[PDB]
Scaffold this motif. Structure first.
Motif, PDB file in Angstrom:
ATOM      1  N   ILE C   1       0.830  -1.203   0.000  1.00 27.37           N
ATOM      2  CA  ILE C   1       0.000   0.000   0.000  1.00 27.37           C
ATOM      3  C   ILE C   1       0.864   1.253   0.000  1.00 27.37           C
ATOM      4  O   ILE C   1       0.472   2.297  -0.537  1.00 27.37           O
ATOM      5  CB  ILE C   1      -0.989  -0.012   1.181  1.00 27.37           C
ATOM      6  CG1 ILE C   1      -1.865   1.244   1.139  1.00 27.37           C
ATOM      7  CG2 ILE C   1      -0.267  -0.103   2.497  1.00 27.37           C
ATOM      8  CD1 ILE C   1      -3.006   1.243   2.108  1.00 27.37           C
ATOM      9  N   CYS C   2       2.064   1.171   0.563  1.00 25.81           N
ATOM     10  CA  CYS C   2       2.952   2.328   0.550  1.00 25.81           C
ATOM     11  C   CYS C   2       3.961   2.175  -0.585  1.00 25.81           C
ATOM     12  O   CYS C   2       4.917   1.411  -0.499  1.00 25.81           O
ATOM     13  CB  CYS C   2       3.662   2.460   1.891  1.00 25.81           C
ATOM     14  SG  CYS C   2       2.608   2.633   3.320  1.00 25.81           S
ATOM     15  N   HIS C  16       5.240   0.053  10.850  1.00 25.63           N
ATOM     16  CA  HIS C  16       4.645   0.856   9.785  1.00 25.63           C
ATOM     17  C   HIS C  16       3.150   1.013   9.995  1.00 25.63           C
ATOM     18  O   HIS C  16       2.556   1.999   9.547  1.00 25.63           O
ATOM     19  CB  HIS C  16       4.898   0.224   8.420  1.00 25.63           C
ATOM     20  CG  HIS C  16       4.485   1.091   7.263  1.00 25.63           C
ATOM     21  ND1 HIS C  16       4.115   0.581   6.037  1.00 25.63           N
ATOM     22  CD2 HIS C  16       4.421   2.439   7.139  1.00 25.63           C
ATOM     23  CE1 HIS C  16       3.839   1.572   5.209  1.00 25.63           C
ATOM     24  NE2 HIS C  16       4.011   2.711   5.855  1.00 25.63           N
ATOM     25  N   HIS C  22       1.523   5.969   6.376  1.00 29.81           N
ATOM     26  CA  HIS C  22       0.712   4.777   6.177  1.00 29.81           C
ATOM     27  C   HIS C  22      -0.758   5.111   6.417  1.00 29.81           C
ATOM     28  O   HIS C  22      -1.641   4.757   5.618  1.00 29.81           O
ATOM     29  CB  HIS C  22       1.218   3.688   7.126  1.00 29.81           C
ATOM     30  CG  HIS C  22       1.003   2.282   6.642  1.00 29.81           C
ATOM     31  ND1 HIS C  22       1.184   1.188   7.458  1.00 29.81           N
ATOM     32  CD2 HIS C  22       0.688   1.791   5.421  1.00 29.81           C
ATOM     33  CE1 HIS C  22       0.965   0.085   6.769  1.00 29.81           C
ATOM     34  NE2 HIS C  22       0.684   0.423   5.526  1.00 29.81           N
TER      35      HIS C  22
HETATM   36 ZN   LIG Z   1       2.541   0.565   4.586  1.00 29.11          ZN
END
Ligand SMILES: [Zn+2]
Ligand SMILES: [Zn+2]
Ligand SMILES: [Zn+2]
Ligand SMILES: [Zn+2]
Lengths: 220, 83, 80, 138, 294, 173, 103
Positions: C1-2, C16, C22
């Motif tokens: 997702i990051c 994270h 995040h």
């Molecule tokens: Zn992440």
């Protein structure tokens, strides 16, 4: 191999779960993950203490170095054997005294902290600070300031705290609508000592088990 | 030596008391023990047996008892299906 | 997702889950913050997870309003 | 005398030494057996809450003293809560945690069976067959 | 006030048919509601098949019941009543007769606050409760817990509890229950203490009395009757009555009643273990319950 | 919810902070660090209230108010398109870059001028992946200030993936 | 046994017979080896009695016991009373290395 690579994603597992936030990444390798999610997320179950997966044998704690050796329960400390025998780096006492300490004085007595249904003691935890915390949420209430913090604050007696003026422009605390403070909503002549204000409650049994008498067993 | 004895006592306790989860036990193996003990107590207490008899509404109570007995084996579901 | 980002440790990646960026990816993505979404990796699954995240009868006068909703009968209060 | 003991076992069970944790568990054995059913379970709940983390502790003496202690707690608390811990740890992936808790669940299944029957966290979505007769209400 | 499988609907009176006045969605835990009961229209205790009692409060203008307490363990509740505002009677499908009480931490909050602030609004909970919410959301979802107050095992399945302010004009209000397999029994709250101290000592006597006979019969064999002689069966009292879950504060009078039938030699043999009053006053205290308490 | 507090005397203790702020609002939690190396308080704390209403209230009334050990107490409250552009002219100012890319899209930050190999390059931050696609489409392989510049995505490998359009769309939303 | 690990038990359905222990082992609950408040006399399966071996101490397995062994009140509640036939079939490394140690 194939069974290790056959595993569903943890987020695929979250949807099966009514309380999805308990499930964790390692539940993906649960041999029966759909079942383990149901058990672990069942109502009253208490998740395994998390000190597993650490090799530290559950206590390496640095905090363990600074733990107090012991403290007598104050009721037992009343028995004065503390002075009779010095534990820190003969002693005869009255049978009636000791017996009454446990029974007459200490029947209703109970340790102050204990723990709750799902309380589990992790390594880094220390209950004592939380005991002084719970006791402190009890003693200390708004509108009152101890003489020590008052001296550090350098507030002389009879003078209101500095936030009473900003509280005059901003208004009473949103968290304490019933709070009263001298000079504003509350009578300044009732200003006394460490208490410059008090909450005025606007709210204004036997529990089927009321004993109505308390009689302990007598030694004699 | 000690753990090795715990293995033998694992074999003995498992023999006497039937299902005891050792380390790895399949959900089919263990849930079967759950069902067997729950039914065991439902039929075992004349109390809960009388209870299930009425709530179920069977014509006789021993129908409920021997029902639970039959319900202990897995194939009894397909057996009911074949009626 | 990051940013399909790389992490060199599992403790770090577990850190994270609580982070500024995040949570910015989650919340700006439309997936609200904190503790339900912690185990997220890919952007897709937490979208269906967030979709998983997100009859009263006021009796009108003709005695047919026993199916009629509260707010509806209040609207007929303003109409009446 | 039970309540005056628990602040002492507070520093005992918490102590780093496996010896102190061992002998303290031995205290909880006899104390829990003879005090079981008196109504001190709330204190027993505490004493246990300090024990559960010690289940994973190795060595034969520590493991058997702690097992016997937890079994004494099964009598003072009753399975239900003691169960609740055992359940939330019952399977688990760790292959180690599992081997450890299935020991406690083996002893629990030995002493109690009917006692554990109501306490199985089993629902129709939890297992396929379940039991059709548990939902009957009259 | 009716309970669906999941949810609790409160129907009013409509014409041509009855209407839903309000609906309250249950916490996820509750599958079905076997039985439920109210306290003075303000409060409710809602039972489950699988799970245990959960208490709700009716909030006017919120038009909803808010759960303020969970229950400790899983218990299958057939029938349920209120002794009080803060305590609840319940039975089990498996024969446990228990009574639970809300903790004083909760009683202070609900006594000092309005129900409308529970669901939404500001209610200040001690640090531990919240940490139990994020730490253990499944158990502590209802943010409080019933401390076990009384627990007991009656091998029958209790159908009906009734709390009678007086039993035949007696002062101590009792609670009488009829079981399914049939039975009627009572739980009498004991005033003072030495009532339950003497009763407790008598129950302790009669508990191992069979073992005392066995040890005397053993010593006389050392100088010159099986173990289950006095109980006729191997079951200990604390063991049998404990069973599913240990009896907590409940002392069982059905045992102490057996002391009445034993011969004078046996009774005087048992009461010697006490520095307290003689067998005659024992029998006095035993027979006192049926006379005075009902 | 949570408020930062600073300029604290290490002699200020946890009970003293609690008793201090309970006068303002109810305090849910207090994290008041303790240095393990020095065995002392590092002189700043964190007070988590029951809501941002009481938090902001305590920020307003508490800031620059209480005097503890003669030192004043302080209170303070507690993902974009990137294009790499190569072979820029030495006569190209950062502000000139701003003017050039404003017509295509709004810049979330200022360009970053750096030299590779001699080779003038810059990073340009767009608020929109689509406007970035516009500056790419028009400005890729183009001659400005008599110098051919190349416009593409900067590396993270490079921006502009499929999930990148999806999530950047959301961050725009 | 509770202390010596290598000692193996019997664990069969106990018969009517009562196990004997020697005066040397007198007073021990055969499971936990506790001296306090004994309750019920031990019962052993017939397979552990038969001939001369019946006279042996069910605890130390060597000496000939006069006295009956009783379970304590802690084992009677833990149910280990009814677990099965307590006996020590193997003499154990302790007693072995003791005998070989002296002679
Ligand atoms: Zn992440
Ligand atoms: Zn044998
Ligand atoms: Zn011997
Ligand atoms: Zn024993």
């Amino acid at each position: 191999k194939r069974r290790k690579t056959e595993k569903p994603s943890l987020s695929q597992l979250k949807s099966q779960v009514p309380y999805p936030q308990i499930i964790e990444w390692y539940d993906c390798d649960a041999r029966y993950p759909g079942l383990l999610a149901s058990i672990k997320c069942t109502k009253n179950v208490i998740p395994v203490p998390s000190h597993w997966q650490s090799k530290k044998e559950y206590l390496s704690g640095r905090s363990l170095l600074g733990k107090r050796p012991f403290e007598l329960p104050d009721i037992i400390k009343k028995t004065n054997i503390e002075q009779m025998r010095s534990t820190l780096p003969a002693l005869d006492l009255d049978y009636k005294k000791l017996h009454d300490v446990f029974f007459k004085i200490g029947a209703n007595w109970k340790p102050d902290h204990l723990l709750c249904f799902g309380d589990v003691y992790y390594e880094n935890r220390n209950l004592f600070e939380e005991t002084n915390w719970k006791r402190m949420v009890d003693h200390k209430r708004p509108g009152r300031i101890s003489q020590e913090l008052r001296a550090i604050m350098n507030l002389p007696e009879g003078q209101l705290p500095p936030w009473c003026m900003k509280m005059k422009d901003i208004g009473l605390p949103t968290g304490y609508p019933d709070l009263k403070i001298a000079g504003l909503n509350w009578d300044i002549t009732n200003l006394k000592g460490d208490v410059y204000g008090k909450i005025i409650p606007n709210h204004h049994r036997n529990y089927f088990g009321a004993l109505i008498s308390f009689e302990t067993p007598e030694f004699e | 030596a000690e753990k090795q004895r715990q293995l033998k006592l694992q074999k003995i306790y498992k023999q006497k008391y039937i299902g005891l989860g050792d380390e790895s036990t399949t959900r089919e193996q263990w849930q079967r023990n759950v069902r067997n003990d729950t039914l065991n107590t439902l039929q075992g207490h004349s109390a809960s047996l009388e209870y299930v008899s009425l709530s179920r509404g069977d014509l006789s109570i021993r129908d409920t008892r021997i029902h639970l007995l039959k319900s202990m084996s897995p194939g009894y579901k397909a057996y009911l299906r074949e009626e | 997702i990051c940013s399909n980002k790389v992490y060199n440790g599992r403790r770090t990646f577990e850190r994270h889950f609580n982070e500024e960026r995040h949570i910015y990816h989650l919340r700006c993505l439309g997936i609200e913050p904190s503790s339900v979404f912690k185990g997220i990796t890919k952007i897709k699954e937490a979208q269906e997870l967030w979709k998983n995240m997100q009859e009263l009868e006021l009796e009108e006068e003709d005695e047919e309003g026993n199916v009629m909703s509260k707010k509806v009968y209040d609207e007929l209060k303003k109409q009446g | 005398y039970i309540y005056f003991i628990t602040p002492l076992l507070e520093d005992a069970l918490t102590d780093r030494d496996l010896v102190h944790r061992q002998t303290a568990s031995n205290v909880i054995t006899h104390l829990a057996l003879n005090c079981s059913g008196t109504g001190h379970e709330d204190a027993f709940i505490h004493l246990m809450n300090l024990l559960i983390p010690n289940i994973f502790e190795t060595s034969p003496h520590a493991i058997m003293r702690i097992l016997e202690g937890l079994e004494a707690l099964s009598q003072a608390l009753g399975p239900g809560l003691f169960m609740n811990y055992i359940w939330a740890g019952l399977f688990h992936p760790a292959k180690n945690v599992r081997k450890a808790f299935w020991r406690v669940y083996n002893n629990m299944y030995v002493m109690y069976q009917d006692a554990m029957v109501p306490f199985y966290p089993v629902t129709p979505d939890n297992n396929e067959e379940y039991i059709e007769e548990l939902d009957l209400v009259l | 006030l009716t309970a669906m499988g999941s949810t609790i609907v409160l129907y009013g009176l409509g014409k041509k048919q009855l209407l839903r006045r309000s609906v309250t969605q249950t916490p996820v835990s509750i599958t079905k509601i076997v039985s439920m009961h109210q306290w003075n229209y303000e409060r409710l205790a809602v039972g489950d098949i699988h799970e245990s009692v959960t208490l709700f409060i009716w909030d006017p203008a919120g038009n909803v019941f808010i759960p303020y307490v969970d229950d400790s363990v899983k218990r299958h509740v057939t029938v349920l009543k209120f002794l009080d505002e803060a305590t609840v009677i319940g039975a089990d499908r498996y024969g446990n007769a228990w009574t639970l009480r809300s903790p004083p931490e909760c009683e202070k909050i609900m006594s000092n606050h309005d129900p409308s602030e529970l669901s939404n609004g500001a209610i200040k909970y001690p640090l531990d409760v919240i940490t139990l919410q994020q730490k253990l959301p499944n158990t502590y979802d209802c943010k409080f817990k019933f401390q076990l107050l009384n627990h007991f095992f009656v091998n029958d399945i209790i159908t009906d509890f009734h709390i009678l302010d007086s039993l035949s004009n007696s002062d101590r209000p009792g609670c009488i229950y009829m079981g399914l397999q049939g039975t009627v029994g009572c739980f009498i709250p004991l005033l003072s203490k030495g009532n339950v101290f003497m009763m407790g000592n008598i129950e302790n006597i009669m508990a191992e009395a069979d073992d005392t006979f066995y040890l005397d019969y053993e010593s006389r064999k050392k100088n010159n009757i099986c173990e289950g002689s006095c109980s006729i069966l191997g079951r200990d009292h604390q063991e049998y009555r404990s069973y599913y879950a240990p009896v907590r504060k409940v002392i069982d009078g059905d045992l102490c009643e057996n002391f009445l039938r034993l011969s004078l030699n046996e009774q005087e043999f048992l009461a010697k273990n006490l520095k307290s009053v003689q067998v005659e006053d024992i029998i006095q205290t035993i027979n006192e319950v049926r006379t005075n308490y009902m | 919810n949570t408020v930062y507090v600073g300029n604290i005397d290490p002699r200020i203790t946890k009970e003293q902070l609690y008793e201090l702020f309970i006068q303002i609002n109810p305090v849910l939690r207090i994290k008041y660090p303790k240095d393990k190396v020095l065995q002392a308080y590092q002189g700043y704390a964190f007070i988590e209230f029951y809501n941002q209403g009481d938090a902001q209230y305590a920020i307003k009334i508490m800031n620059n108010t209480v005097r503890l050990y003669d030192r004043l107490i302080k209170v303070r409250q507690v993902p974009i398109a990137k294009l790499f552009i190569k072979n820029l002219a030495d006569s190209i100012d950062s502000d000139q870059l701003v003017k050039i890319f404003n017509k295509f899209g709004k810049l979330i930050r200022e360009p970053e001028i750096f030299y590779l190999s001699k080779l003038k390059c810059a990073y340009v931050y767009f608020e929109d992946f689509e406007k970035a696609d516009l500056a790419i489409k028009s400005l890729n392989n183009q001659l400005v200030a008599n110098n051919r510049i190349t416009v593409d995505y900067a590396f993270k490998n490079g921006k502009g993936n499929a999930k990148y359009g999806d999530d950047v769309d959301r961050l725009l939303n | 046994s509770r202390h010596q690990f290598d000692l193996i038990m019997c664990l069969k359905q106990p018969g009517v017979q009562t196990g004997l222990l020697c005066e040397k082992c007198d007073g021990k609950c055969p499971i936990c080896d506790s001296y306090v408040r004994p309750k019920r006399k031990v019962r052993v399966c017939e397979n552990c009695s038969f001939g001369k071996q019946a006279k042996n101490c069910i605890i130390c397995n060597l000496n000939v016991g006069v006295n009956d062994a009783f379970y304590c009140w802690e084992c009677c509640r833990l149910g280990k009373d009814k677990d099965g036939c307590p006996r020590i079939l193997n003499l154990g490394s302790n007693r072995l290395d003791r005998h070989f140690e002296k002679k």
